[PDB]
Amino acid sequence: HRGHKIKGTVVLMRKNVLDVNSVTSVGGIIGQGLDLVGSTLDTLTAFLGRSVSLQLISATKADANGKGKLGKATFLEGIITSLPTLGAGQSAFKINFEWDDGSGIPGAFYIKNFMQTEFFLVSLTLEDIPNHGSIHFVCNSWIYNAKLFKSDRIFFANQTYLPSETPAPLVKYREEELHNLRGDGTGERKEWERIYDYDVYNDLGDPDKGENHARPVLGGNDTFPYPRRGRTGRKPTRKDPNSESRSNDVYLPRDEAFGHLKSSDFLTYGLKSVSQNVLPLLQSAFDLNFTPREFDSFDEVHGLYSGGIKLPTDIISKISPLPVLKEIFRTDGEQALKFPPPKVIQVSKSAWMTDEEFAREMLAGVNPNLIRCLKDFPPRSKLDSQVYGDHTSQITKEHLEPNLEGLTVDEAIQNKRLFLLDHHDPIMPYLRRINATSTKAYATRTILFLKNDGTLRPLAIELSLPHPQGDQSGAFSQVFLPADEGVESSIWLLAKAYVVVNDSCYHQLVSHWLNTHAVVEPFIIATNRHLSVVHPIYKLLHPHYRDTMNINGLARLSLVNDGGVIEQTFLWGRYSVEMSAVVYKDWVFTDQALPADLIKRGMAIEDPSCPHGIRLVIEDYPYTVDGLEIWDAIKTWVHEYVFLYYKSDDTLREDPELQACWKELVEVGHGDKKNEPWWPKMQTREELVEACAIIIWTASALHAAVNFGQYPYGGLILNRPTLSRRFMPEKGSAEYEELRKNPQKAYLKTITPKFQTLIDLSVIEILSRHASDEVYLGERDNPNWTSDTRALEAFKRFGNKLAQIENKLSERNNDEKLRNRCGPVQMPYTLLLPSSKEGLTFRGIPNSISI
Ligand SMILES: O=[N+]([O-])c1ccc(O)c(O)c1
Ligand SMILES: [Fe+3]
């Protein structure tokens, strides 16, 4: 009929616009400028000669051995000044492809960059030729120089395909890229590479600096099982072949590292700079005298948010002009590092000391995930051939009968009004070693009572120490009781500090690090290795992985390494990451589902009468009531989406990419748990629904709930101390007499010191921030990720459900009957509101673990 020209438009982004090193002059307004319409300021000429070639690949027409026909390699040929839909930072180019009827419909293209500098390819649009709409290619990928790659970068069109549905001329192109994504499991990984594979955590220590810097390998053994992380390829340590050598640069596959248009959104780079630059320069102010080394009063802790802390020019003038830190540090002139007032004291400076708030934060605070309903009394331990495990807690029936309600202990258990916060088992086998450092800690249990007003009240705290004389005859325990006058109340405040210290560390290593960051990483690796970019399930999961391998690789470098911030700041110290591996021994994938978690802790009973199929034992449990709505929204979306693609349970059993993905996930990625009976088989569509809903819940809402309340609750070190360094003052002594005369100073010398307070605050302020270009749950994706209009509609229904839920959650915050939502601290629980603007907001649910 006619040999035609297909009109293409390519959208790309120049490195300079996305790169941290060059973007460090622009960070206050972005989205704006003449939405960098590329054209103006001609670097764009450099793209226009024999610089960049594209080569179209037919989806319908095949050569002799069955692969889609290649068109002619075509170079970029003109700059497009403006498009209705051109965004900030983006540059557009026209290219015309010679094609004909006989070559059919394009379904992929190859691209070669002949420039020395990489660029970020955004999209290709083809404006076609037969009775056929536009073809869209969503790329989002860095394109490095063509002679670095053995085969050309390939990109597929918009169309979602199951493996049995991919156009025959494209079958080999699909499997070849999947093979290229796997690598062969050898070699040192390079910056430009997009190779996904697994390794154990043999990465965190530095045995070449000494024996005291070595850390156990986590994963691949029964003592310390762990999920895998991204394989990097470095040479082993000289002292230990089983440990990988340290580097200042950690590889991750190239498109897992996201750039930003704005200086202030480069938050990993801020974290990195705190460890590298701010910590040594702070640590030189305590190493002589410009700062008093200890806090002497509570007033001096509050000074941090008013006038802040005096530092000399010397240090201040080196820390004021770094890149990203310009936002998260406030500086008066010379002598001030200030901190923003944490939401916990904005209404009342003293309401955190209240028993009601202490209890409330177990349901609505940073770690709202651990509380259990007491089923039998006294509470038991799950520890072994020691005794206090086959024995019990030393909290007694007569310890618990006081003022409010007047029931027996059995009556309160029967009516489900007793609750437990149990921090006894994880720290106990390490307690003896921990207490030989500067740290002094206890293993704690707290029993809480549900009052008639719907609030919780702490009733008893058990402080346990390892061994009067050896691990044989169990816990040495004392129990403490609430009081509100005299020395007794100062003692009770300290008793609560020893609980929170356990809870902060468990929150950081397990609720946050293990259960979100570490556990999610092998799913990203499995997904990229085995599911084509074209697969429906790849498209469902992909936004929930954004930037995760990036923050995790930075954590291995600076957060969770030997001598890094977690070891210096938190209670478990040098045993921190190991102890999280011990706890991973009890991790079950299917108990991460929110209703399964709730039932397992006895916080809910199953009930078809009730909105989400369960009945709560505490109705005003803000994490759980709000989380249930978001869980249900997630589950309904995943179900609608899955059941659009899979015609039967058989179609899922026949899908080789999905089957291989899940098999490698179980056998390798979470490979220390490969023989556990609770892993879903992927033999049924409802099992794919459940697993995908658990992954998405984990990456989005669970991580938000546990992450973005850290500065607002714990930016006052007094409310969430991270370590203790003194035992309880004994009844007739000099420390007891100090507790009588100056209990503030006594509290202050028990908790985290001033130096590590300053580190902790600096880190959790960055961690509690949303970047400007955060992509939130729901409505938000990158752009038009599929051409399946049934999926687009179903995704719009999801976003609509979430905006409906946002309103319902906000109206709950205005309900005067629900007082665990606010507390005496007058802090409305907004952590599970899906949207947010940027900054230290105490809300917003990102798609992924992004910080
Ligand atoms: O709990 N952790 O180890 C952390 C703390 C902060 C992070 O940014 C992170 O990736 C991990
Ligand atoms: Fe995080």
Side-chain angles (χ1 to χ4, degrees):
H1 250 106
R2 159 195 169 137
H4 197 63
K5 259 182 199 139
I6 302 190
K7 312 165 168 250
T9 118
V10 166
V11 173
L12 60 88
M13 294 186 91
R14 262 156 355 167
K15 192 200 177 180
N16 306 246
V17 128
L18 252 13
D19 199 35
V20 69
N21 306 281
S22 64
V23 122
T24 31
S25 68
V26 184
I29 11 118
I30 255 315
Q32 266 62 266
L34 296 182
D35 272 47
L36 177 14
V37 280
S39 74
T40 315
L41 189 145
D42 250 343
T43 36
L44 290 224
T45 276
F47 288 87
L48 234 42
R50 286 208 157 229
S51 295
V52 181
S53 79
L54 274 82
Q55 182 177 32
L56 250 36
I57 304 162
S58 187
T60 58
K61 241 57 169 233
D63 67 353
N65 227 54
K67 316 180 82 178
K69 187 138 317 285
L70 296 175
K72 325 202 178 158
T74 309
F75 287 85
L76 260 41
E77 94 200 32
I79 298 155
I80 304 229
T81 2
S82 215
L83 284 181
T85 185
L86 201 63
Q90 301 181 338
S91 300
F93 297 91
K94 31 177 167 199
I95 173 175
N96 296 318
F97 295 101
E98 313 208 338
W99 197 255
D100 40 348
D101 291 314
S103 266
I105 303 165
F109 69 97
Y110 281 137
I111 187 172
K112 298 170 92 83
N113 182 20
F114 297 104
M115 313 183 68
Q116 217 65 54
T117 295
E118 69 275 29
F119 60 80
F120 183 79
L121 180 70
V122 178
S123 59
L124 175 65
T125 286
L126 305 182
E127 265 151 52
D128 232 79
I129 168 228
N131 188 18
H132 202 312
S134 303
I135 306 178
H136 301 260
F137 299 79
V138 168
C139 304
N140 297 320
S141 184
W142 289 90
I143 312 300
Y144 280 76
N145 184 278
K147 78 203 145 98
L148 286 193
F149 293 98
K150 97 220 266 154
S151 33
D152 305 344
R153 284 296 273 110
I154 190 191
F155 288 105
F156 294 90
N158 228 4
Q159 279 77 238
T160 299
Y161 300 119
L162 283 179
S164 55
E165 298 167 339
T166 133
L170 258 34
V171 168
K172 278 189 198 171
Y173 289 111
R174 183 172 170 154
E175 58 181 40
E176 199 176 35
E177 221 225 338
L178 244 27
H179 172 250
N180 286 301
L181 257 0
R182 279 175 219 125
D184 54 16
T186 71
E188 187 180 356
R189 294 283 69 89
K190 319 286 192 185
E191 185 203 307
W192 26 275
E193 286 183 323
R194 304 150 63 238
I195 290 168
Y196 293 79
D197 210 335
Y198 312 87
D199 214 340
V200 295
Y201 284 72
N202 69 156
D203 209 10
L204 274 21
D206 199 357
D208 290 349
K209 285 185 178 137
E211 45 257 38
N212 102 264
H213 294 268
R215 286 312 174 265
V217 33
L218 310 177
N221 57 90
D222 296 299
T223 306
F224 292 126
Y226 225 54
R228 310 271 99 100
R229 44 84 170 196
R231 190 180 171 270
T232 42
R234 304 172 230 124
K235 62 188 202 341
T237 272
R238 288 164 106 216
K239 276 223 78 172
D240 177 23
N242 296 304
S243 286
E244 189 172 349
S245 59
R246 282 245 111 201
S247 210
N248 255 311
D249 296 312
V250 288
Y251 165 89
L252 49 139
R254 194 45 193 91
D255 299 332
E256 307 297 333
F258 281 80
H260 310 274
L261 249 18
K262 225 197 244 180
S263 204
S264 45
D265 293 337
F266 277 97
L267 300 177
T268 58
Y269 191 91
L271 235 12
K272 185 164 183 200
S273 300
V274 160
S275 327
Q276 236 137 113
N277 281 279
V278 179
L279 192 157
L281 288 179
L282 234 39
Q283 198 215 77
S284 273
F286 289 95
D287 263 306
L288 270 201
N289 236 329
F290 279 112
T291 12
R293 182 188 263 268
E294 298 277 340
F295 298 123
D296 282 341
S297 76
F298 280 9
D299 307 342
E300 249 196 58
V301 186
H302 291 289
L304 261 25
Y305 327 110
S306 341
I309 164 183
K310 290 172 150 213
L311 244 17
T313 323
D314 263 319
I315 294 140
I316 280 297
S317 257
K318 287 174 171 175
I319 92 168
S320 88
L322 324 129
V324 186
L325 288 96
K326 197 166 152 126
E327 160 152 318
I328 77 251
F329 284 167
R330 339 176 131 234
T331 311
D332 188 30
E334 240 134 65
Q335 331 277 94
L337 186 59
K338 270 171 212 169
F339 287 87
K343 229 185 195 296
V344 87
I345 61 200
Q346 279 184 24
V347 166
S348 160
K349 274 119 230 11
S350 78
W352 69 269
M353 303 193 250
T354 254
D355 276 353
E356 309 92 279
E357 179 63 11
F358 168 77
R360 195 187 68 88
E361 279 182 30
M362 297 173 192
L363 305 164
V366 77
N367 199 30
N369 219 346
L370 202 33
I371 185 154
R372 300 178 154 266
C373 194
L374 221 37
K375 305 301 196 196
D376 34 28
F377 195 80
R380 312 154 139 188
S381 155
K382 254 207 109 328
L383 299 169
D384 211 294
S385 138
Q386 14 223 156
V387 298
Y388 65 128
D390 321 324
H391 221 108
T392 21
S393 174
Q394 297 197 196
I395 300 178
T396 198
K397 277 194 204 172
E398 33 284 302
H399 270 142
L400 305 177
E401 321 188 273
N403 186 39
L404 205 264
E405 244 292 75
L407 298 87
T408 49
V409 165
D410 184 40
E411 219 156 18
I413 279 152
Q414 190 196 136
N415 299 350
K416 315 203 172 280
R417 286 180 78 162
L418 292 159
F419 300 91
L420 167 74
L421 212 229
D422 181 10
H423 281 294
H424 191 100
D425 299 341
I427 192 168
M428 194 43 103
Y430 277 89
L431 216 38
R432 58 205 245 139
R433 282 171 277 180
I434 283 171
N435 290 160
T437 39
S438 18
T439 297
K440 308 282 170 308
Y442 298 86
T444 67
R445 291 188 187 105
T446 308
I447 279 120
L448 303 109
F449 180 55
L450 185 72
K451 288 190 260 199
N452 274 152
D453 51 20
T455 55
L456 226 41
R457 189 185 150 183
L459 239 50
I461 286 175
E462 174 170 27
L463 297 190
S464 291
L465 275 189
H467 46 47
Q469 43 248 214
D471 300 319
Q472 311 261 50
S473 204
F476 171 42
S477 281
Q478 43 236 307
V479 359
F480 291 100
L481 256 21
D484 51 41
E485 356 239 288
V487 214
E488 292 92 76
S489 73
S490 284
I491 280 199
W492 174 247
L493 188 50
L494 258 59
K496 285 195 285 186
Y498 291 120
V499 173
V500 173
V501 153
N502 276 175
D503 196 274
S504 293
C505 197
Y506 192 93
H507 165 264
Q508 186 67 219
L509 275 302
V510 172
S511 294
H512 176 226
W513 169 254
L514 183 64
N515 286 178
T516 61
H517 291 257
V519 137
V520 165
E521 183 160 355
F523 293 92
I524 307 185
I525 301 154
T527 299
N528 283 99
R529 273 175 67 92
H530 282 287
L531 259 26
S532 187
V533 275
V534 136
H535 189 111
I537 297 309
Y538 186 104
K539 303 192 173 192
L540 173 69
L541 265 21
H542 190 249
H544 304 283
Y545 299 155
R546 179 190 234 243
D547 235 3
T548 302
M549 298 192 65
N550 202 187
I551 323 281
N552 285 8
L554 168 76
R556 299 209 305 284
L557 173 64
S558 293
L559 265 28
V560 103
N561 59 313
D562 135 81
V565 356
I566 284 148
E567 284 192 10
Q568 301 188 83
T569 292
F570 293 85
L571 178 73
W572 303 345
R574 76 157 277 163
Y575 308 111
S576 293
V577 199
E578 270 164 68
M579 292 173 63
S580 78
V582 174
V583 176
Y584 174 73
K585 282 161 110 279
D586 297 318
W587 176 92
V588 356
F589 180 63
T590 43
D591 288 340
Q592 308 296 307
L594 176 72
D597 169 63
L598 258 22
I599 297 166
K600 177 188 204 170
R601 294 152 44 214
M603 289 312 288
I605 51 133
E606 231 180 55
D607 199 354
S609 242
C610 292
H612 308 91
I614 56 177
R615 212 265 220 91
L616 304 179
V617 310
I618 298 187
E619 265 164 78
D620 189 4
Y621 180 176
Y623 169 68
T624 277
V625 216
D626 295 5
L628 247 11
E629 313 281 345
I630 283 139
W631 166 263
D632 257 18
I634 288 168
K635 212 209 184 101
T636 300
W637 156 234
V638 169
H639 189 109
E640 294 195 0
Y641 185 95
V642 166
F643 276 65
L644 227 43
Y645 295 98
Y646 289 104
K647 289 172 207 215
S648 48
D649 291 341
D650 268 326
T651 284
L652 189 118
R653 304 199 279 250
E654 288 172 354
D655 177 343
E657 277 180 12
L658 182 79
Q659 291 309 132
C661 175
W662 192 250
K663 173 192 218 243
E664 192 186 78
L665 187 277
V666 170
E667 288 179 0
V668 179
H670 273 286
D672 307 317
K673 284 163 172 311
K674 59 168 128 162
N675 298 126
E676 304 289 359
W678 40 251
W679 285 112
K681 286 197 182 169
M682 221 22 107
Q683 297 295 274
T684 243
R685 287 169 305 171
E686 290 288 357
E687 288 176 315
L688 179 62
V689 174
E690 190 86 355
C692 285
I694 297 168
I695 293 157
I696 298 175
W697 166 260
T698 298
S700 63
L702 181 62
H703 178 262
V706 129
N707 187 65
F708 294 99
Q710 294 182 86
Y711 193 89
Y713 280 107
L716 211 232
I717 196 61
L718 269 23
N719 182 232
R720 303 285 294 177
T722 65
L723 72 95
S724 44
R725 355 166 230 168
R726 260 213 325 185
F727 282 142
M728 189 72 86
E730 143 214 59
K731 233 213 141 233
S733 230
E735 7 271 317
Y736 200 85
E737 230 28 57
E738 186 181 55
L739 217 238
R740 264 218 246 271
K741 288 155 188 231
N742 195 354
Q744 286 191 179
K745 176 60 169 177
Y747 191 82
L748 260 358
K749 58 213 291 220
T750 296
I751 66 160
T752 312
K754 182 170 173 195
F755 170 69
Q756 280 90 14
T757 288
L758 290 197
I759 298 181
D760 178 50
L761 257 50
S762 303
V763 175
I764 69 172
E765 202 201 331
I766 293 166
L767 257 30
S768 309
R769 199 160 236 87
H770 295 293
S772 247
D773 58 357
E774 200 90 93
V775 187
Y776 293 94
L777 195 71
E779 156 260 311
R780 304 195 235 283
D781 276 34
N782 263 171
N784 276 183
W785 49 276
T786 182
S787 68
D788 186 346
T789 76
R790 314 146 331 147
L792 259 8
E793 210 100 276
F795 189 62
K796 259 251 157 241
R797 223 151 33 233
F798 175 47
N800 260 239
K801 181 92 137 293
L802 253 14
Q804 190 167 77
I805 283 162
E806 184 162 299
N807 296 170
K808 185 190 270 85
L809 260 33
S810 313
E811 90 146 71
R812 281 181 190 165
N813 284 152
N814 278 87
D815 190 336
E816 75 282 0
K817 294 155 241 102
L818 312 176
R819 286 302 75 152
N820 299 336
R821 284 194 79 86
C822 290
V825 108
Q826 280 174 242
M827 203 162 163
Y829 191 72
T830 50
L831 245 17
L832 251 1
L833 271 49
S835 271
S836 182
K837 43 179 142 212
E838 49 152 348
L840 227 47
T841 66
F842 158 74
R843 56 183 217 134
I845 295 169
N847 274 327
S848 72
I849 293 143
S850 57
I851 186 64

